Design a protein around this ligand. Structure first.
Ligand SMILES: CCCCCCCCCCCCCCCCCC(=O)OC[C@H](COP(=O)([O-])OCC(O)COP(=O)([O-])OC[C@@H](COC(=O)CCCCCCCCCCCCCCCCC)OC(=O)CCCCCCCCCCCCCCCCC)OC(=O)CCCCCCCCCCCCCCCCC
Ligand code: BCL
Ligand SMILES: CC[C@H]1c2cc3[nH]c4c(c3C)C(=O)[C@H](C(=O)OC)c4c3nc(cc4[nH]c(cc(n2)[C@@H]1C)c(C(C)=O)c4C)[C@@H](C)[C@@H]3CCC(=O)OC/C=C(\C)CCC[C@H](C)CCC[C@H](C)CCCC(C)C
Ligand SMILES: CCCCCC/C=C\CCCCCCCCCC(=O)O[C@H](COC(=O)CCCCCCCCCCCCCCC)COP(=O)(O)OC[C@@H](O)CO
Ligand SMILES: CCCCCC/C=C\CCCCCCCCCC(=O)O[C@H](COC(=O)CCCCCCCCCCCCCCC)COP(=O)(O)OC[C@@H](O)CO
Ligand SMILES: COC(C)(C)C/C=C/C(C)=C/C=C/C(C)=C/C=C/C(C)=C/C=C/C=C(C)/C=C/C=C(\C)CC/C=C(\C)CCC=C(C)C
Ligand SMILES: COC(C)(C)C/C=C/C(C)=C/C=C/C(C)=C/C=C/C(C)=C/C=C/C=C(C)/C=C/C=C(\C)CC/C=C(\C)CCC=C(C)C
Ligand SMILES: COC(C)(C)C/C=C/C(C)=C/C=C/C(C)=C/C=C/C(C)=C/C=C/C=C(C)/C=C/C=C(\C)CC/C=C(\C)CCC=C(C)C
Ligand SMILES: COC(C)(C)C/C=C/C(C)=C/C=C/C(C)=C/C=C/C(C)=C/C=C/C=C(C)/C=C/C=C(\C)CC/C=C(\C)CCC=C(C)C
Ligand SMILES: COC(C)(C)C/C=C/C(C)=C/C=C/C(C)=C/C=C/C(C)=C/C=C/C=C(C)/C=C/C=C(\C)CC/C=C(\C)CCC=C(C)C
Ligand SMILES: COC(C)(C)C/C=C/C(C)=C/C=C/C(C)=C/C=C/C(C)=C/C=C\C=C(C)\C=C\C=C(/C)CC/C=C(\C)CCC=C(C)C
Ligand SMILES: CCCCCCCCCCCCO[C@@H]1O[C@H](CO)[C@@H](O[C@H]2O[C@H](CO)[C@@H](O)[C@H](O)[C@H]2O)[C@H](O)[C@H]1O
Ligand SMILES: CCCCCCCCCCCC[N+](C)(C)[O-]
Ligand SMILES: [Fe+3]
Lengths: 306, 54, 246, 281, 43, 54, 54, 54, 42, 43, 43, 54, 43, 43, 43
């Protein structure tokens, strides 16, 4: 049979890689954890070390409180029964306050008060993690592309839970903390605004979710195809172009009529993924605030018969 | 009950002050937000009823 | 502010959808011109610049500093396939294949091509060699999988071509790169791991047949492989799927 | 009009059909045997969509739709104005996709690279063939396939989804959606991580894949590697499409009722079906 | 011991400053609780 | 019992105190939230009923 | 029977002490949650009935 | 209590000011948001009804 | 010898480990005795 | 032994101070529980 | 002598500038609360 | 408050000025949109009602 | 200190310009508020 | 036989201690079953 | 101060031209606002 380079047939293990200390505070960085043979069949086997500094403490402890607050509400909702908690785990939900309160913070802890407490913990945990994502790149002297790409996903996160509920004047517009609960919110959000399919930015946002899936299947298959020429090390292909980068480019040149470079394909990748949540934030922020029926708005804008 | 000053010979002062500062901030807001949630201690609503406001 | 339109039916949702078309057009211009930093300007079938260069202008040069005093790479810049391309065109007109003027695998054309890269080893962040034999790397062992050392190497013609002597490993990535295989001639050649199939009792190389291992390009140092040697070895072996499976 | 390094790669060979009959390049495109087939099928299907517009009486591209034959025709042929044109365009699209996948195989052989790309494209083709051919054939009529309109193929999705209630509750849908979200998240991380290494802070040396591992170990405590991330990106998308086609080949052929009611098998397990409290008890 | 390298002189000087702020923070909290209890007791 | 001092010779003091500090706070937050949920011990509501604040 | 100390020549004391502490606390909270769920042992709700606080 | 200046030999000034500046802005916005949310302290509404503007 | 202890080190360690174990069970017995008086389960 | 690097003399100093905080913590807990039981007993 | 490479006299000056800005920020805040409380008390 | 000039020996002028420009502009646009939403202070509507332009 | 590379005189030079713009920007803001409060007071 | 690095003496004393623990565990099991059978017999 | 390399003579020359354009653009804006205000004032 023919080797398709999808699983490593042979694993080689040596000293634990402790990383490089460009400007990293080496005190905060922990020690190397275990080695996973199962993960070694697909990628690296080494787990850790992890940098837990000042924004790591703030993010992990706030993220713990957000996670633990929702858990205790689920134990209360289960009547403190371990079996009932297991049974109805996907049905429990922590919900925002009723629309009668608007944006006011005077809602009882059982009627959207714990939601505000959990939401604050999530606000601190997510935003602190963006700062940690920024600062971890800075200590290694690397570009901030990870921080700014993450900021695109935070944009949709802030539109769903904070920005739009402020603009709509009530916390009841926000997303409940549950598994089946936030699926119902998604289904009902479309029905209230008249078939969200006809939102132009939801349509664009889907174009880049399919485009990301299309692009990573293309890029991942291209690299594994030219991995026989040392194509996986894309960083050294950028510095000194080799036969892997030339065959990868000439495949898509002969197929599509245009191609990319080894570095330029990762600009397509980052820009295709950030538009998924950048466009989604606008479409969500326009729903109800500017358009309260996307099928009727569509009818006036082509897109649908009169 | 006096040799607690040795704890700064074991624990990094920078990490301890940061964790303690994070803990108090999160704790203070949670208690303040609880008091707002309880209608009997919401000091904004209490004054509204007392002084005949909205 | 539902239904508020500045003119016609152009509301805040129309301003948003039309602003995105302009932003997307600017982004596609940027993303495409950032991908013209290699392989441009376009050439004719013989080497001269073509009369058509496309709608997109070339970008402005950027300098890449190299991480171990290896120089500054500026793209786009002067380019040349610094090697003797041994091909003769099959037609006077353009768009037709070029036939090799001899042995294609040795001459380095077609699917057996190689690029004249920097003739130095690839370095990790500590400045050492990224790839080195496992018996030289300290503490490296075969943690899982069939240890493919001492197994015979069978070619695409189902004839034995040698047996594995060592494994060349990528020190920072911690993955196997090449199999060093000793031939009946007593010499050693490198075979990329992606091109081998390690079975329970042998290593099968579907690319090359038995009487082609002696033609794999060799390495100037027993414990050090350079980018030029990697490209010749990888290009030669993978070029046998087309020129060496008759 | 060749790339500066393209002359040594244009060699004759690696053609499944022909060998010199259709072994040439028209501009940058490779015209194989299946390039001739792909162009004919791509061109015919487009002009049929243009022709179906004049039968529909519209020129707005967002209103043009080609509808499948009505449910009264079953699985046979149909008049051209009703749904016969859809069947020709579906055949033309099916021919163009398979020829495009087959044409990519000839390009892989001529460059001597692996066949990962054509294999991954066949997953898209199989998902498409599931929606227009395999699933309608099981259900019994061509009228269950989606129409060929920009905004009317969304109406097919919405109408089909709400036939089974909220489609979010399809268990294979949830798995597929998870793979799609993970694939886009990993694509943002992969592009950003490589770009940050190639484009460091300012006046700094280009970073190394040892900085790429270190960044993600500092961040999330693990790093899948440069080879691992590309295997993962390929497998996330193929998995996303596999469970996409899985969730629709079981909808209306095996499962017929609301997808919410499926999850009552867990909540009605004998050992906790009667414990009072919670949401369902 | 010897995890951070701070001497006894440094540890005593660090603890003395830190414990000074602890009573400054605890005194403000005690006054605040006493003030709120007069205004609106909870027991 | 008098030999319990050797636990530190096994466990890192830095790791034990972190694990214990997070443990106690989540244990204490859990217990308060259980009393808060139960109407018989919600001291915020018990005071409101006593002093007629609602 | 008076030879059980030899288990510590087999198992690392650090992994046992961590695993045991996780096990016992998880076991203890599980039993306390079983008693809270059963209304005949809910000591929070038992006390409410006894002193008629509701 | 007059030795708090020694905190600057522990924490980097470039990091404290950024941490402090972010915190003070978000605290000010958070309190201003609470006041606007409650109709009793929404000063834009208070003047609107005081001068009979709406 | 997997953990690298000596024979007397295991003797010393296990003596303390049992010392804590009987301390834990002594509280557990008192805890279980107190509950049985308050509300028996048998 | 000595996984953490603490000597026998250093471990005694650490444990002795650790118990001092433990007993201080529980004494507050005992007074707190005694105050609650007098206020609203649960048994 | 420190964790940040700052001499004691450098720390003495930096803290004096900081506390100057903190009294200024605090004094302006006290005026803001005093004006708001007289305008519309929250007690 | 005479030694504030030394803040520029800590923070890069380029980063401070850009950060303020984003902050000051976003703050002003936020307040202008907050006023434009409230019908009492919407200066475009006030002029229409005052001058009877509808 | 001195983490930016500016000398002492340069920080004096930069601050004097920054404060000039700050007072110029604030002076317009105060007149802008003064006009609006006269036209339509919010208190 | 090998396969682990144990010896005849090492396996015998390992079995002696292990099997003694097996009887100790079964000693509790018999007593517990006997008490349950007195309380609520299932036979 | 060499963040960009302007030699204090280009910056003076560059800033003179920028202010010349700045005043011209402000001059046209003032005329436009005076024209709109006389047309239909917004105050
Ligand atoms: C926004 C705040 C800025 C964030 C980014 C800051 C930045 O520059 O980082 C560069 C970042 C890292 O830079 P670095 O590490 O400092 O640079 C290191 C070296 O200098 C080397 O760096 P480098 O060379 O790799 O970086 C160069 C890169 C950096 O450039 C950018 O970052 C461009 C950022 C554009 C943001 C657009 C926001 C959304 C606008 C939508 C418009 C409506 C629809 O250049 C570009 O990416 C150009 C992008 C295409 C520009 C052309 C588009 C033209 C439009 C039409 C013009 C003609 C008409 O590189 C990136 O490529 C990041 C890409 C992802 C950006 C995501 C932005 C998300 C913003 C939040 C969500 C959306 C908010 C709400 C929007 C809608 C409101 C209603
Ligand atoms: C019936 C329901 C409606 C519908 C209602 C909605 C609603 C409502 C929304 C979408 C949105 C989207 N829809 Mg839709 N959608 C429908 C039909 C579809 C169909 C289809 C084939 O029919 C597809 C493919 C899609 C796909 C999409 C995406 C393009 C888009 C989601 C982007 C995203 O990844 O957000 C997911 C990513 C985020 C939300 C960002 C999260 C990042 C945060 C900061 C990270 C937090 C981590 C957290 C703390 C956990 C930590 C864990 C530990 C770290 C381990 N929809 C139908 C018509 N859809 C979203 C959108 O924006 O579109 C406009 C959206 O709000
Ligand atoms: C399976 C994983 C993902 C994937 C992978 C993937 N796609 C691929 C490939 C791969 C690996 C290619 O190699 C191939 C390629 O070359 O890409 C540039 C391709 C490709 N995927 C494409 C599109 C595409 N992929 C999609 C999805 C996905 N592709 C998956 C998510 C989608 C979605 C979700 O909508 C689209 C639109 C093309 C860019 C390209 C294949 C081009 C092709 O087939 O060329 C020949 C055919 C034509 C030129 C057009 C023929 C037109 C017909 C005759 C008429 C119209 C028929 C059509 C059904 C009408 C639709 C109407 C409405 C529904 C709008
Ligand atoms: C979080 C709150 C959970 C608390 C439950 C556990 C409470 C403490 C009980 C453990 C007793 C020792 C406590 C301790 O302080 O142990 C510490 C670690 O605790 C640890 O991670 C403890 C965490 C291990 C995983 C805990 C999972 C249980 C909670 C699940 C909740 C869902 C120190 O251990 P180490 O020196 O790093 O070990 C060395 C390694 O070789 C062992 O593998
Ligand atoms: C509300 C108040 C909570 C504020 C956080 C309380 C603790 C204050 C100290 C943490 C502030 C901090 O320092 O971290 C912040 C975390 O924000 C956070 O949790 C809070 C949320 C930040 C939101 C910023 C954007 C809002 C829109 C943000 O990261 P920074 O360090 O700014 O990144 C610096 C780089 O971007 C530039 O050098
Ligand atoms: C839901 O349940 C609720 C929340 C309602 C109930 C739950 C309540 C719980 C669990 C409460 C828990 C409370 C706890 C654990 C409180 C602990 C509080 C503590 C320990 C506060 C300590 C504060 C100490 C402070 C603020 C000290 C400050 C010191 C300074 C500011 C000085 C710093 C300067 C220094 C150190 C310079 C010295 C440097 C040198 C070089 C000498
Ligand atoms: C759902 O079920 C519920 C929750 C209702 C019931 C379940 C309840 C359960 C399972 C409860 C479990 C409770 C347990 C196991 C509690 C254990 C508590 C312990 C062990 C508390 C110990 C506290 C000790 C403390 C706080 C000691 C603090 C000491 C210091 C702060 C001093 C610092 C140390 C110094 C200074 C050492 C210095 C010496 C040197 C050499 C540096
Ligand atoms: C919903 O919440 C609302 C919005 C209602 C209430 C929230 C209110 C809040 C949080 C308000 C916060 C307000 C703040 C933080 C205001 C602070 C304002 C400040 C500090 C403004 C300072 C402005 C200073 C400026 C604009 C100075 C500019 C300086 C120049 C233009 C001069 C140019 C400088 C040069 C040339 C230096 C160059 C270097 C040399 C050597 C010449
Ligand atoms: C659904 O079906 C139902 C449940 C209704 C009925 C089905 C019941 C079934 C299928 C039950 C199956 C039961 C079985 C197979 C039970 C087997 C039980 C056994 C064999 C338990 C053995 C326990 C052994 C123990 C606890 C041994 C402990 C040993 C020690 C504590 C000594 C410690 C070991 C040391 C110190 C190693 C010595 C080291 C050196 C170096 C000498
Ligand atoms: C919804 O919210 C609303 C809109 C209602 C409220 C929002 C209000 C806001 C955000 C107001 C903000 C207003 C601001 C900040 C306005 C700023 C305006 C400025 C700064 C205008 C400046 C104009 C300057 C110009 C046009 C200068 C042009 C110069 C030239 C055309 C000449 C070019 C000269 C060169 C290149 C010099 C070359 C010299 C050498 C030596 C090379
Ligand atoms: C046995 O289990 C234990 C108890 C140990 C732990 C178990 C925990 C469990 C079961 C956790 C379950 C967690 C789940 C199901 C989480 C689901 C989360 C989901 C689906 C979230 C989806 C969307 C959430 C969003 C979009 C949140 C957005 C929030 C913001 C954008 C910021 C919110 C801030 C606000 C609203 C204002 C806060 C400000 C103040 C001043 C309160
Ligand atoms: C491609 C990127 C660049 C786009 C062009 C650059 C300018 C961007 C702004 C264009 C705004 C004008 O866009 C134009 O708006 C008017 C406003 O009702 C639309 O509306 C007009 O046609 C529609 C559709 O028949 C009618 O329902 C409507 O009654 C009529 O007024 C036009 O259909 C649209 O073409
Ligand atoms: C759906 C089209 C399938 C065509 C597959 C490609 C052809 C395979 C056989 C090629 C070799 C044939 N032949 C006669 C030379 O042996
Ligand atoms: Fe890549």
């Amino acid at each position: 049979a023919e080797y398709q380079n999808i699983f490593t047939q042979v694993q080689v293990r040596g000293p634990a890689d402790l990383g490089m200390t460009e400007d990293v505070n080496l005190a905060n960085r922990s020690g190397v954890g275990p080695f996973s043979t199962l993960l070694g069949w697909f990628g690296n086997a080494q787990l850790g070390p992890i940098y837990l500094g000042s924004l790591g403490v703030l993010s992990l402890f706030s993220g713990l409180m957000w996670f633990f607050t929702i858990g205790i509400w689920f134990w209360y909702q289960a009547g403190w029964n371990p079996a009932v908690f297991l049974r109805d785990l996907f049905f429990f939900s922590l919900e925002p306050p009723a629309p009668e309160y608007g944006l006011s913070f005077a809602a009882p802890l059982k009627e959207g008060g714990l939601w505000l407490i959990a939401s604050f913990f999530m606000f601190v945990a997510v935003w602190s993690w963006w700062g940690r994502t920024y600062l971890r790149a800075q200590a290694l002297g690397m570009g901030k592309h990870t921080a700014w790409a993450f900021l695109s996903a935070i944009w949709l996160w802030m539109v769903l839970g904070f920005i739009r509920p402020i603009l709509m004047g009530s916390w009841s517009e926000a997303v409940p903390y549950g598994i089946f609960s936030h699926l119902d919110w998604t289904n009902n959000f479309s029905l209230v605004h008249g078939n969200l399919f006809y939102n132009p930015f939801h349509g664009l946002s889907i174009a880049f979710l399919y485009g990301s899936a299309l692009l990573f299947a293309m890029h991942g298959a291209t690299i594994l195809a030219v991995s026989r020429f040392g194509g996986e090390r894309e960083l050294e292909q950028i510095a000194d172009r080799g036969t892997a980068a030339e065959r990868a480019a000439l495949f898509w040149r002969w197929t599509m009529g245009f191609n990319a470079t080894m570095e330029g394909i990762h600009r397509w990748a980052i820009w295709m993924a950030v538009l998924v949540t950048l466009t989604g934030g606008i479409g969500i922020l326009l729903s109800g605030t500017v358009v309260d029926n996307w099928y009727v708005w569509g009818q006036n804008h082509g897109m649908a018969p009169l | 009950m006096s040799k607690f000053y040795k704890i700064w010979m074991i624990f990094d002062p920078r990490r301890v002050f940061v964790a303690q500062g994070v803990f108090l901030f999160l704790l203070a807001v949670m208690i303040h937000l609880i008091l707002l949630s309880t209608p009997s201690y919401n000091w904004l609503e209490i004054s509204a009823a007392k002084y005949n406001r909205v | 502010m539902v239904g508020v339109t500045a003119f016609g039916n152009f509301d805040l949702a129309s301003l948003a959808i039309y602003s995105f078309w302009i932003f997307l057009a600017g982004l596609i211009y940027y993303l495409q011109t950032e991908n013209m930093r290699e392989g441009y300007p376009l050439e004719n079938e013989d080497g001269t610049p073509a009369a058509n260069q496309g709608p997109f202008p070339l970008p402005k040069p950027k300098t890449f500093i190299l991480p171990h005093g290896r120089g500054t790479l500026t793209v786009p810049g002067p380019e040349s396939e610094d090697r003797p391309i041994a091909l003769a065109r099959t037609a006077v007109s353009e768009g037709f294949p070029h036939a090799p003027t001899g042995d294609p695998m040795k001459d380095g054309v077609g699917p057996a091509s190689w690029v004249a890269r920097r003739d130095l080893p690839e370095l990790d962040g500590h400045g050492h060699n990224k790839i080195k034999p496992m018996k030289a790397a300290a503490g490296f062992y075969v943690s899982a999988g069939k240890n493919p050392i001492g197994l015979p190497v069978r070619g695409c013609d189902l004839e034995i071509a040698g047996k594995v002597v060592d494994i060349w490993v990528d020190i920072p990535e911690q993955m196997a790169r090449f199999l060093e295989v000793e031939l009946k001639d007593g010499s050693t050649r490198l075979l990329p791991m992606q091109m081998v199939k390690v079975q329970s009792n042998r290593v099968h190389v579907n690319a090359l047949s038995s009487d082609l291992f002696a033609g794999i390009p060799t390495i100037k140092s027993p414990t050090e492989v350079t980018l030029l040697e990697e490209d010749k070895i990888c290009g030669y072996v993978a070029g046998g799927l087309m020129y060496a499976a008759p | 009009a060749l790339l500066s390094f393209e002359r040594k790669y244009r060699v004759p060979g690696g053609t499944l059909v022909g060998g010199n009959l259709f072994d040439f390049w028209v501009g940058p495109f490779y015209v194989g045997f299946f390039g001739v087939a792909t162009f004919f099928f791509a061109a015919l299907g487009i002009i049929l969509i243009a022709w179906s517009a004049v039968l529909q009486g519209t020129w707005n591209p967002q209103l043009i739709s080609v509808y499948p034959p009505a449910l009264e025709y079953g699985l046979g042929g149909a008049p051209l104005a009703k749904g016969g044109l859809w069947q020709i365009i579906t055949i033309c699209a099916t021919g163009a996709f398979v020829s495009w996948a087959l044409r990519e195989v000839e390009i892989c052989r001529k460059l001597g690279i692996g066949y990962h790309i054509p294999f991954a494209f066949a997953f898209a083709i199989l998902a498409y063939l599931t929606l227009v051919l395999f699933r309608p054939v099981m259900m019994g009529a061509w009228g269950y396939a989606f129409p060929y309109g920009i905004w009317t193929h969304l109406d097919w999705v919405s109408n089909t989804g709400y036939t089974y209630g909220n489609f979010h509750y399809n268990p294979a849908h949830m798995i597929a959606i998870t793979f799609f979200f993970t694939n886009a998240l990993a694509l943002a991380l992969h592009g950003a991580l490589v770009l940050s290494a190639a484009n460091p802070e300012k006046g700094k040396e280009m970073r190394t894949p040892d900085h790429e591992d270190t960044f993600f170990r500092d961040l999330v405590g693990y790093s899948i590697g440069t080879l691992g991330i590309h295997r993962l990106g390929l497998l996330l998308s193929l998995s996303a499409v596999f469970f996409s086609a899985l969730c629709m080949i079981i909808t209306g052929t095996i499962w017929f009722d609301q997808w919410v009611d499926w999850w009552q098998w867990w909540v009605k397990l004998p050992w906790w079906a009667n414990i009072p409290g919670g949401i369902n008890g | 011991l010897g995890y951070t390298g701070l001497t006894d002189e440094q540890a005593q000087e660090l603890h003395s400053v830190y414990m000074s702020g602890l009573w400054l923070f605890s005194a403000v909290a005690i006054v605040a609780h006493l003030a709120v209890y007069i205004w609106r007791p909870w027991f």
